[PDB]
Design a protein around this ligand. Sequence first.
Ligand code: ET
Length: 165
Amino acid sequence: MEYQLQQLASLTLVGIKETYENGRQAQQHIAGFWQRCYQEGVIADLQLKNNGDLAGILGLCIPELDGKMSYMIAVTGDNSADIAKYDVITLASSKYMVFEAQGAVPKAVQQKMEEVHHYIHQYQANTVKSAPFFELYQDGDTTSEKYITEIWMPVKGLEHHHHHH
Ligand SMILES: CC[n+]1c(-c2ccccc2)c2cc(N)ccc2c2ccc(N)cc21
Protein backbone atom coordinates (compact mmCIF):
# COMPACT_ATOMS: atom_id res chain seq x y z
CA MET A 1 0.00 0.00 0.00
CA GLU A 2 1.15 3.53 -0.71
CA TYR A 3 2.08 5.79 2.20
CA GLN A 4 4.38 8.62 3.15
CA LEU A 5 6.50 9.01 6.23
CA GLN A 6 5.91 12.21 8.12
CA GLN A 7 6.82 13.48 11.53
CA LEU A 8 5.23 15.98 13.84
CA ALA A 9 6.49 17.99 16.72
CA SER A 10 4.33 18.53 19.76
CA LEU A 11 1.17 20.46 18.91
CA THR A 12 -1.68 22.22 20.63
CA LEU A 13 -5.10 21.30 19.26
CA VAL A 14 -8.31 23.26 19.76
CA GLY A 15 -11.80 21.89 19.22
CA ILE A 16 -14.51 19.67 20.56
CA LYS A 17 -14.25 16.14 21.87
CA GLU A 18 -17.10 13.71 22.22
CA THR A 19 -16.96 10.21 23.75
CA TYR A 20 -18.68 7.04 22.53
CA GLU A 21 -18.86 3.46 23.84
CA ASN A 22 -16.55 1.94 21.26
CA GLY A 23 -15.33 2.16 17.69
CA ARG A 24 -18.50 0.78 16.20
CA GLN A 25 -20.73 3.18 18.09
CA ALA A 26 -18.46 6.07 17.15
CA GLN A 27 -18.92 5.38 13.46
CA GLN A 28 -22.65 5.55 13.97
CA HIS A 29 -22.40 9.03 15.52
CA ILE A 30 -19.35 10.73 13.95
CA ALA A 31 -21.20 11.89 10.85
CA GLY A 32 -23.80 13.41 13.15
CA PHE A 33 -21.16 15.15 15.25
CA TRP A 34 -19.71 16.74 12.14
CA GLN A 35 -23.21 17.78 11.07
CA ARG A 36 -23.88 19.34 14.45
CA CYS A 37 -20.54 21.17 14.42
CA TYR A 38 -21.21 22.67 10.97
CA GLN A 39 -24.79 23.63 11.85
CA GLU A 40 -23.85 25.37 15.07
CA GLY A 41 -21.03 27.24 13.35
CA VAL A 42 -18.29 25.44 15.23
CA ILE A 43 -16.39 24.51 12.10
CA ALA A 44 -16.38 28.07 10.81
CA ASP A 45 -15.15 29.32 14.16
CA LEU A 46 -12.40 26.68 14.40
CA GLN A 47 -11.29 27.47 10.87
CA LEU A 48 -10.60 31.10 11.88
CA LYS A 49 -8.30 29.83 14.68
CA ASN A 50 -5.66 27.57 13.01
CA ASN A 51 -2.22 28.97 13.18
CA GLY A 52 -1.32 27.02 10.08
CA ASP A 53 0.72 24.28 11.69
CA LEU A 54 -1.48 21.78 9.93
CA ALA A 55 -3.58 22.69 6.93
CA GLY A 56 -7.14 21.66 7.48
CA ILE A 57 -9.40 20.30 10.14
CA LEU A 58 -8.63 17.15 12.02
CA GLY A 59 -10.86 14.29 13.03
CA LEU A 60 -8.98 12.45 15.76
CA CYS A 61 -9.84 9.09 17.18
CA ILE A 62 -8.63 8.99 20.78
CA PRO A 63 -8.66 5.81 22.84
CA GLU A 64 -9.94 6.17 26.37
CA LEU A 65 -8.60 4.14 29.30
CA ASP A 66 -11.86 2.34 30.06
CA GLY A 67 -12.11 0.97 26.53
CA LYS A 68 -14.32 3.78 25.29
CA MET A 69 -13.50 5.70 22.13
CA SER A 70 -13.43 9.46 21.72
CA TYR A 71 -13.54 11.61 18.60
CA MET A 72 -12.31 15.15 18.43
CA ILE A 73 -12.86 17.67 15.69
CA ALA A 74 -10.02 20.16 15.88
CA VAL A 75 -7.44 22.48 14.33
CA THR A 76 -3.87 23.27 15.33
CA GLY A 77 -4.11 26.45 17.33
CA ASP A 78 -2.15 28.83 19.47
CA ASN A 79 -2.08 28.46 23.19
CA SER A 80 -2.30 32.18 23.68
CA ALA A 81 -6.04 32.74 23.30
CA ASP A 82 -8.67 32.91 26.05
CA ILE A 83 -10.25 29.82 24.57
CA ALA A 84 -12.75 29.18 27.36
CA LYS A 85 -15.47 27.29 25.45
CA TYR A 86 -13.34 24.75 23.54
CA ASP A 87 -11.61 21.52 24.53
CA VAL A 88 -7.83 21.74 24.33
CA ILE A 89 -5.19 19.02 24.07
CA THR A 90 -1.55 18.52 23.35
CA LEU A 91 -0.71 16.03 20.63
CA ALA A 92 2.59 14.36 21.48
CA SER A 93 5.31 14.28 18.87
CA SER A 94 5.34 11.20 16.68
CA LYS A 95 6.25 9.72 13.35
CA TYR A 96 3.41 8.58 11.11
CA MET A 97 2.46 6.52 8.11
CA VAL A 98 0.27 8.83 6.03
CA PHE A 99 -2.29 7.43 3.62
CA GLU A 100 -4.63 8.99 1.11
CA ALA A 101 -8.27 8.45 0.35
CA GLN A 102 -9.49 9.73 -2.98
CA GLY A 103 -13.19 10.18 -3.24
CA ALA A 104 -16.34 11.63 -1.81
CA VAL A 105 -16.36 11.93 1.94
CA PRO A 106 -17.01 9.96 3.88
CA LYS A 107 -17.45 6.72 1.96
CA ALA A 108 -14.05 7.06 0.34
CA VAL A 109 -12.53 7.56 3.77
CA GLN A 110 -14.29 4.60 5.37
CA GLN A 111 -13.27 2.19 2.67
CA LYS A 112 -9.66 3.44 2.63
CA MET A 113 -9.58 2.98 6.51
CA GLU A 114 -10.67 -0.62 6.43
CA GLU A 115 -7.84 -1.10 3.99
CA VAL A 116 -5.39 0.78 6.17
CA HIS A 117 -6.24 -1.23 9.25
CA HIS A 118 -5.74 -4.39 7.26
CA TYR A 119 -2.36 -3.22 5.98
CA ILE A 120 -1.02 -2.16 9.37
CA HIS A 121 -1.85 -5.62 10.69
CA GLN A 122 1.65 -6.54 9.61
CA TYR A 123 3.28 -3.79 11.64
CA GLN A 124 2.07 -4.74 15.09
CA ALA A 125 5.25 -3.79 16.95
CA ASN A 126 5.40 -0.47 15.15
CA THR A 127 1.85 0.93 15.44
CA VAL A 128 0.89 2.79 18.62
CA LYS A 129 -2.56 1.75 19.87
CA SER A 130 -2.85 4.18 22.72
CA ALA A 131 -1.84 7.03 20.46
CA PRO A 132 -4.40 9.11 18.56
CA PHE A 133 -4.78 8.61 14.82
CA PHE A 134 -6.55 11.07 12.58
CA GLU A 135 -8.11 12.13 9.32
CA LEU A 136 -6.97 15.45 7.97
CA TYR A 137 -9.41 17.39 5.79
CA GLN A 138 -7.95 20.07 3.55
CA ASP A 139 -9.91 22.95 2.01
CA GLY A 140 -11.88 21.80 -1.03
CA ASP A 141 -15.05 20.11 -2.17
CA THR A 142 -15.74 16.98 -0.20
CA THR A 143 -18.22 15.87 -2.82
CA SER A 144 -15.72 15.58 -5.61
CA GLU A 145 -14.43 12.16 -6.32
CA LYS A 146 -11.02 13.70 -6.78
CA TYR A 147 -10.97 14.96 -3.19
CA ILE A 148 -8.17 13.73 -0.98
CA THR A 149 -8.44 12.95 2.69
CA GLU A 150 -5.25 12.11 4.55
CA ILE A 151 -5.11 9.39 7.15
CA TRP A 152 -2.37 9.65 9.74
CA MET A 153 -1.42 6.53 11.70
CA PRO A 154 1.25 6.94 14.41
CA VAL A 155 4.27 4.63 14.57
CA LYS A 156 7.41 3.81 16.56
CA GLY A 157 10.62 2.11 15.38
CA LEU A 158 9.33 1.53 11.86
CA GLU A 159 12.89 1.60 10.51
CA HIS A 160 13.55 -1.65 12.33
CA HIS A 161 10.80 -3.55 10.52
CA HIS A 162 12.24 -6.50 8.57
CA HIS A 163 10.45 -5.48 5.38
CA HIS A 164 12.78 -2.51 5.33
CA HIS A 165 15.95 -4.56 5.27
C1 ET B 1 -21.54 14.26 8.07
C2 ET B 1 -20.87 14.28 6.72
N1 ET B 1 -19.46 14.71 6.81
C3 ET B 1 -19.07 15.92 6.35
C4 ET B 1 -20.03 16.87 5.70
C5 ET B 1 -20.62 16.58 4.48
C6 ET B 1 -21.52 17.47 3.89
C7 ET B 1 -21.81 18.67 4.54
C8 ET B 1 -21.21 18.97 5.76
C9 ET B 1 -20.33 18.07 6.34
C10 ET B 1 -17.65 16.35 6.46
C11 ET B 1 -17.24 17.57 5.99
C12 ET B 1 -15.90 17.94 6.11
N2 ET B 1 -15.51 19.13 5.65
C13 ET B 1 -14.96 17.11 6.70
C14 ET B 1 -15.33 15.87 7.20
C15 ET B 1 -16.65 15.47 7.09
C16 ET B 1 -17.10 14.17 7.59
C17 ET B 1 -16.21 13.30 8.18
C18 ET B 1 -16.66 12.08 8.65
C19 ET B 1 -18.00 11.73 8.52
N3 ET B 1 -18.40 10.53 8.98
C20 ET B 1 -18.92 12.58 7.92
C21 ET B 1 -18.54 13.82 7.44
